[PDB]
Amino acid sequence: GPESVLVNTYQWIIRNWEAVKIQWSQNPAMLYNKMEFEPFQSLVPKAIRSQYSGFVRTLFQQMRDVLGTFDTTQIIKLLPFAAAPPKQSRMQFSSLTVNVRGSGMRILVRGNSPVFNYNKTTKRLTILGKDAGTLIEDGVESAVLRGFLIIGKEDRRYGPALSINELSNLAKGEKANVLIGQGDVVLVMKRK
Amino acid sequence: GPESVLVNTYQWIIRNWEAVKIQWSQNPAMLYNKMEFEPFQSLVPKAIRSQYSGFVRTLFQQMRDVLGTFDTTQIIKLLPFAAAPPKQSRMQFSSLTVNVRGSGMRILVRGNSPVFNYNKTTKRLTILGKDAGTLIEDGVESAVLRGFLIIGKEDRRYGPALSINELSNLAKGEKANVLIGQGDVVLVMKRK
C-alpha cells in the first residue's frame, strides 16, 4: 500500500546510493526523471507536486553550488519530490505532503519527522517507524530555504525573528533571525 | 509598557468604534493614517510591517467588496496592522507578530488567540488576559486569505487539503480544501 511505497522508495535510494549520488552531481535531470520515482509521486497531491519539485530542484542546486554543504540525509529525503515536472514559485515550504495511512502526512524539510527519521546514533533511516537501511555518509544548511543559507545560531544583532514567509523583501546578503521550528531560531543569510 | 500599548490600542478602537466603523467604509486610507496607531506600529517588526499592512489593507477591501461578510471582530483585530505604508506580496500570513512581554507574540489572523480573544458569550474583547471592552456588532470569511474566500466546511470532492502556502497556482474560481489550523480543514475559493 501507500506506506509500503514510501518505505520502498527510500530503501531503493539507499540500496542504489552509490550510483544515485554520482548522478545527483553529474546529471541530476536524468536522475529526477527516473521511472522508479513514479509510485512516490502518486502519493504527492497533484495540485502541488510541480511546485514541490521546482522547490527541491532549486534547493539541490544551492547545495551543489555552496562548498562543503553536501548532506546525504537531506538529498535522500527530498529526492523523490524532484520527480515531477517542475514549476517555480516564491513560497517557502516547511514540510511536504505525502498521502499515506489514509491521510496527508507531512515530511519536514529540515531535520527529522515521524515520516522520515534518520538516526545519527545508529546511522539508519526509519520511515513511518520501519527500517529503510543504513546511510553511508560522504555548519551551513543550503537545502532548506530557497534563496537562503542557514548559517548558525540566533544573533540578536539582526533583530526580531521572522517566520519563513516573512523573508521575501530582505536584501541580497542580508542576515536575519528566523523561527525555523518550535523554539528553534536560526540565523539565515539571503544569498547574493 | 508594550502590553499596555496593545491593550490601549484595542480599547481606543472600541471606544471610538462608531466613528471608526464609518471611516473604515467611507475613507479607509484616512483611517489607516491616523496618528493613534503609531504606538502599536512600534511593536511590529520593522522588516515586515509594510507587508503586513499591504496584506491587511487587501483583506479589508475583500470584505468591502463581498456582500454580507462584514466582521466587526476581524476589522478591530487587524486594523492597527494597516497603519504602515503598504507593500504588496504574494504571501499568506496566518499570524502577525507584535513585540510584547519581551518576545514576539503572534496574533492569529483567523479567530482567537492568547493575544486577541473575543468572547462570543460575554461579547467582550480580552487582550493578553485583560479586558478591552464590549464589541457592538453591526458564513463566508473574506478577510483571512488574500485572493480567497473561505466558503464553508471541507468537501472531499475537491481533493487533498493544501496548506495556505500551497494555493498560488489554483485557478480563478477554483475550490480547494485548506488546512487553516490544527484539525480544521475548510473549503476555500480563489476569487475571480
C-alpha cell at A99: 498521502
Task: Give the CATH number of the domain where residue A181 resides.
Answer: 3.30.30.90
Considering the domain architecture, whether residues A41 and A130 belong to the same structural domain is answered as yes
Residue B152 near residue B160 (C-beta atoms within 8 A): no
Report d(CA A15, CA A7) in Å as an integer. 12
The alpha-carbon gap from A168 to the nearest alpha carbon of chain B, in Å, equals 8
Structurally, chain A folds into a number of domains equal to 2
Considering the domain architecture, whether residues B131 and B183 belong to the same structural domain is answered as no
Query: Do residue B45 and residue A99 have CB atoms under 8 angstroms apart?
Result: no
Considering the domain architecture, whether residues A127 and A156 belong to the same structural domain is answered as no
Considering the domain architecture, whether residues B103 and B20 belong to the same structural domain is answered as yes
Report d(CA B49, CA A167) in Å as an integer. 12
Determination technique used: X-ray
Instruction: Quote the domain boundaries for residue B94.
Output: 1-140
3-state secondary structure of A46: coil
Considering the domain architecture, whether residues B36 and B125 belong to the same structural domain is answered as yes
**Chain A positions touching chain B (beta carbons under 8 Å):** 45-48, 50-51, 87, 89-93, 95, 97, 99, 104, 159-163, 165-166, 168-170, 176
Report d(CA A153, CA A147) in Å as an integer. 18
Q: Which residues of B touch A51 (CB under 8 A)?
A: 166, 168-169
Using the structure block, give the residue that is written with the C-alpha cell 548532506. Answer: A71
Residue B161 near residue B177 (C-beta atoms within 8 A): yes
Considering the domain architecture, whether residues B50 and B130 belong to the same structural domain is answered as yes
The alpha-carbon gap from A45 to the nearest alpha carbon of chain B, in Å, equals 6
Report d(CA B62, CA B147) in Å as an integer. 8
C-alpha cell at A63: 547545495
Considering the domain architecture, whether residues A102 and A175 belong to the same structural domain is answered as no
Report d(CA B118, CA B78) in Å as an integer. 13
Report d(CA B173, CA B188) in Å as an integer. 10
Pairing between β-strand A130-134 and β-strand A124-127 as defined by DSSP bridges: antiparallel
